[PDB]
Design a protein around this nucleic acid. Structure first.
Length: 195
DNA sequence: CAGCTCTGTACGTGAGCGATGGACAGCT
DNA sequence: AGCTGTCCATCGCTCAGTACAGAGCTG
């Protein structure tokens, strides 16, 4: 990574971009090597997050990782991760790391209380649900989850990971449907507040 | 048995590497 | 005309969670 060792990137962390009164908080799994390197969220040239944000209309123009600090103020979107530690892949993390992460995540969500907690990846919500709601469904599905963050009105919404790793949603286009439904849910919630 | 949990395998696109080699121009 | 080096187009290749079978567990 421009002469920067993998060993150096593994020690690096990615700061959260969180504020109060947010519509959405994107919760990633943990920082990848490129995110740790850049110090920005979803810089993966193949990661579908920014493409999907635009293709869905959640951003009116095409943005990139360098824009992530403007997302709270201009788009009502923030970022955090289930696990802070940088790894080359999601499977390099332990069960205890994820459950430590879940506990830390629920406290951050109870503080900032965004309208919607968006789990960027089914695997992290599977862990979160089990730990926080004590729920393990056989048929865990994407989309809105039937449980609010404890002691809040924050909804849980799950999407296929923006990572281009999963073959089941091979392209940004195959994930865009979930980002459109996320936008619609945000619009419904703001409309409920209005009336 | 029947429903779980746990573990290992298999899977589609597209961005961007290093390697390769074709096009081309400068120079003799 | 022949030589040679740069540039760049192009190629092969790598690589950034999810689903599900089946072994194991247990009521």
């Amino acid at each position: 990574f421009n002469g920067v060792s993998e060993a150096e990137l593994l020690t690096k962390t990615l700061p959260d971009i969180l504020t109060f009164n947010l519509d959405i908080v994107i919760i990633g799994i943990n920082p990848g090597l490129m995110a740790a390197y850049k110090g920005h969220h979803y810089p993966g040239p193949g990661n579908h997050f920014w493409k999907c944000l635009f293709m869905s209309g959640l951003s009116e123009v095409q943005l990139n990782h360098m824009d992530d600090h403007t997302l709270p103020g201009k788009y009502g979107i923030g970022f955090t991760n289930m696990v802070e530690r940088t790894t080359p892949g999601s499977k390099d993390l332990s069960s205890k790391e994820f459950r430590e992460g879940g506990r830390i995540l629920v406290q951050k969500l109870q503080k900032y209380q965004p309208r919607i907690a968006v789990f960027n990846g089914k695997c992290i919500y599977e862990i979160f649900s089990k730990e926080v709601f004590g729920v393990k469904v056989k048929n865990l599905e994407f989309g809105l989850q039937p449980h609010k963050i404890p002691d809040t009105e924050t909804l849980c919404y799950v999407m296929p990971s923006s990572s281009a790793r999963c073959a089941q949603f091979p392209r940004a286009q195959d994930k865009v449907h979930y980002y459109i439904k996320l936008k619609d849910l945000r619009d419904q919630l703001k409309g409920i507040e209005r009336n």
